Design an enzyme around this catalytic site. Structure first.
Site, PDB file in Angstrom:
ATOM      1  N   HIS A  46       0.816  -1.211   0.000  1.00  0.00           N
ATOM      2  CA  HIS A  46       0.000   0.000   0.000  1.00  0.00           C
ATOM      3  C   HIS A  46       0.848   1.260   0.000  1.00  0.00           C
ATOM      4  O   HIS A  46       1.923   1.279   0.613  1.00  0.00           O
ATOM      5  CB  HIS A  46      -0.854   0.069   1.265  1.00  0.00           C
ATOM      6  CG  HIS A  46      -1.760  -1.103   1.456  1.00  0.00           C
ATOM      7  ND1 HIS A  46      -2.021  -1.640   2.693  1.00  0.00           N
ATOM      8  CD2 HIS A  46      -2.439  -1.856   0.562  1.00  0.00           C
ATOM      9  CE1 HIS A  46      -2.842  -2.664   2.558  1.00  0.00           C
ATOM     10  NE2 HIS A  46      -3.113  -2.816   1.274  1.00  0.00           N
ATOM     11  N   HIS A  48       0.640   4.626   1.824  1.00  0.00           N
ATOM     12  CA  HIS A  48       0.012   5.232   2.990  1.00  0.00           C
ATOM     13  C   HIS A  48       0.186   6.738   2.917  1.00  0.00           C
ATOM     14  O   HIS A  48       1.033   7.269   2.189  1.00  0.00           O
ATOM     15  CB  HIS A  48       0.604   4.643   4.283  1.00  0.00           C
ATOM     16  CG  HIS A  48       0.077   3.278   4.629  1.00  0.00           C
ATOM     17  ND1 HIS A  48      -0.250   2.920   5.919  1.00  0.00           N
ATOM     18  CD2 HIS A  48      -0.206   2.202   3.861  1.00  0.00           C
ATOM     19  CE1 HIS A  48      -0.700   1.678   5.931  1.00  0.00           C
ATOM     20  NE2 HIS A  48      -0.673   1.213   4.700  1.00  0.00           N
ATOM     21  N   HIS A  63      -4.349   4.662   4.677  1.00  0.00           N
ATOM     22  CA  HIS A  63      -4.034   4.599   3.263  1.00  0.00           C
ATOM     23  C   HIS A  63      -4.138   5.968   2.622  1.00  0.00           C
ATOM     24  O   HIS A  63      -4.907   6.818   3.047  1.00  0.00           O
ATOM     25  CB  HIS A  63      -4.966   3.616   2.555  1.00  0.00           C
ATOM     26  CG  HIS A  63      -4.806   2.211   3.036  1.00  0.00           C
ATOM     27  ND1 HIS A  63      -5.519   1.151   2.520  1.00  0.00           N
ATOM     28  CD2 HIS A  63      -3.967   1.688   3.958  1.00  0.00           C
ATOM     29  CE1 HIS A  63      -5.156   0.043   3.137  1.00  0.00           C
ATOM     30  NE2 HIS A  63      -4.210   0.339   4.009  1.00  0.00           N
ATOM     31  N   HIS A  71     -11.830   1.276   0.753  1.00  0.00           N
ATOM     32  CA  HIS A  71     -10.711   0.417   0.405  1.00  0.00           C
ATOM     33  C   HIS A  71     -11.127  -0.661  -0.599  1.00  0.00           C
ATOM     34  O   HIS A  71     -12.244  -1.196  -0.519  1.00  0.00           O
ATOM     35  CB  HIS A  71     -10.172  -0.252   1.675  1.00  0.00           C
ATOM     36  CG  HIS A  71      -9.010  -1.156   1.425  1.00  0.00           C
ATOM     37  ND1 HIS A  71      -7.733  -0.691   1.165  1.00  0.00           N
ATOM     38  CD2 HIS A  71      -8.949  -2.501   1.335  1.00  0.00           C
ATOM     39  CE1 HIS A  71      -6.938  -1.722   0.933  1.00  0.00           C
ATOM     40  NE2 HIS A  71      -7.647  -2.832   1.054  1.00  0.00           N
ATOM     41  N   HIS A  80      -8.972   3.176  -2.651  1.00  0.00           N
ATOM     42  CA  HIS A  80      -8.089   4.275  -2.332  1.00  0.00           C
ATOM     43  C   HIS A  80      -7.001   4.397  -3.401  1.00  0.00           C
ATOM     44  O   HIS A  80      -6.622   3.417  -4.025  1.00  0.00           O
ATOM     45  CB  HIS A  80      -7.380   4.012  -1.005  1.00  0.00           C
ATOM     46  CG  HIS A  80      -8.297   3.760   0.160  1.00  0.00           C
ATOM     47  ND1 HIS A  80      -8.017   2.853   1.160  1.00  0.00           N
ATOM     48  CD2 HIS A  80      -9.481   4.332   0.490  1.00  0.00           C
ATOM     49  CE1 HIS A  80      -8.983   2.901   2.062  1.00  0.00           C
ATOM     50  NE2 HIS A  80      -9.888   3.777   1.670  1.00  0.00           N
ATOM     51  N   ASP A  83      -4.125   1.796  -2.932  1.00  0.00           N
ATOM     52  CA  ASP A  83      -4.460   0.370  -2.883  1.00  0.00           C
ATOM     53  C   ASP A  83      -3.824  -0.445  -4.014  1.00  0.00           C
ATOM     54  O   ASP A  83      -4.417  -0.637  -5.091  1.00  0.00           O
ATOM     55  CB  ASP A  83      -5.980   0.212  -2.925  1.00  0.00           C
ATOM     56  CG  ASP A  83      -6.639   0.685  -1.665  1.00  0.00           C
ATOM     57  OD1 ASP A  83      -5.894   0.922  -0.679  1.00  0.00           O
ATOM     58  OD2 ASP A  83      -7.895   0.834  -1.645  1.00  0.00           O
ATOM     59  N   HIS A 120       2.966  -5.241   4.336  1.00  0.00           N
ATOM     60  CA  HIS A 120       2.281  -5.712   5.542  1.00  0.00           C
ATOM     61  C   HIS A 120       2.569  -7.160   5.909  1.00  0.00           C
ATOM     62  O   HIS A 120       3.057  -7.952   5.110  1.00  0.00           O
ATOM     63  CB  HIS A 120       0.759  -5.554   5.369  1.00  0.00           C
ATOM     64  CG  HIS A 120       0.281  -4.151   5.543  1.00  0.00           C
ATOM     65  ND1 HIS A 120      -0.047  -3.633   6.775  1.00  0.00           N
ATOM     66  CD2 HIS A 120       0.089  -3.155   4.650  1.00  0.00           C
ATOM     67  CE1 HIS A 120      -0.439  -2.381   6.629  1.00  0.00           C
ATOM     68  NE2 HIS A 120      -0.348  -2.059   5.355  1.00  0.00           N
ATOM     69  N   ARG A 143       2.638  -3.351   9.952  1.00  0.00           N
ATOM     70  CA  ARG A 143       3.521  -2.800   8.928  1.00  0.00           C
ATOM     71  C   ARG A 143       4.922  -3.365   9.176  1.00  0.00           C
ATOM     72  O   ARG A 143       5.522  -3.125  10.218  1.00  0.00           O
ATOM     73  CB  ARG A 143       3.502  -1.267   8.997  1.00  0.00           C
ATOM     74  CG  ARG A 143       2.094  -0.689   8.825  1.00  0.00           C
ATOM     75  CD  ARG A 143       2.056   0.844   8.801  1.00  0.00           C
ATOM     76  NE  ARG A 143       2.160   1.410  10.141  1.00  0.00           N
ATOM     77  CZ  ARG A 143       1.158   1.488  11.021  1.00  0.00           C
ATOM     78  NH1 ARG A 143      -0.048   1.027  10.711  1.00  0.00           N
ATOM     79  NH2 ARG A 143       1.367   2.017  12.224  1.00  0.00           N
TER      80      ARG A 143
HETATM   81 CU   LIG Z   1      -1.604  -0.609   4.520  1.00  0.00          CU
HETATM   82 ZN   LIG Z   2      -6.877   1.168   1.049  1.00  0.00          ZN
END
Ligand SMILES: [Cu+2]
Ligand SMILES: [Zn+2]
Ligand SMILES: [Zn+2]
Ligand SMILES: [Zn+2]
Ligand SMILES: [Zn+2]
Length: 153
Positions: A46, A48, A63, A71, A80, A83, A120, A143
């Site tokens: 992702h 962020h 995000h 999401h 997002h 994503d 992640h 994370r």
């Molecule tokens: Cu994330």
């Molecule tokens: Zn997201």
């Protein structure tokens, strides 16, 4: 063409170098590179929101969601900006990234440059999960490594 690199680091073994390239200011962005030190399987991947001068994965937070959407996976209409779905690590812990994306950009008002790339602990459920948290984060756990997306030097 515009290029960026994110160096992923964390408190554990997870590390990698991720490249970005966008040949036209409104063209698709290609993302590639390798991440090592991962457990075998899917890992959420992702962009962020965090863009301040914080140390590590601590503040990465939500995000990157400049259009205030829910999401999703990268191919979902509802997602997002940040994503980018999942990457897959093999048995010795290496995940090869190869992504082409139409929603992120390296230029203009909502550029991902300066934002925080994150890999992640677990799989992203792609917003298809059974709670509201799925529609915010995809339930991808901790994370493991992060880095600022910087213009290539
Ligand atoms: Cu994330
Ligand atoms: Zn997201
Ligand atoms: Zn700011
Ligand atoms: Zn901040
Ligand atoms: Zn805006």
């Amino acid at each position: 063409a515009t290029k960026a690199v994110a160096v992923l680091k964390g408190d554990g073994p997870v590390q990698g170098i991720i490249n970005f390239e966008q040949k036209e200011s409104n063209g698709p962005v290609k993302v590639w590179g390798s991440i090592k030190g991962l457990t075998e399987g899917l890992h959420g991947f992702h962009v962020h929101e965090e863009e301040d001068n914080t140390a590590g994965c601590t503040s990465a937070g939500p995000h990157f969601n400049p259009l205030s959407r829910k999401h999703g996976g990268p191919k979902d209409e509802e997602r997002h900006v940040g994503d980018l779905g999942n990457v897959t690590a093999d048995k010795d812990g290496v995940a090869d990234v190869s992504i082409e994306d139409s929603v992120i950009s390296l230029s203009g008002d909502h550029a991902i440059i300066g934002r925080t790339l994150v890999v992640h602990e677990k799989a992203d459920d792609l917003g298809k999960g059974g709670n509201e948290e799925s529609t915010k984060t995809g339930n991808a756990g901790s994370r493991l490594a992060c880095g600022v997306i910087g213009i290539a030097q």
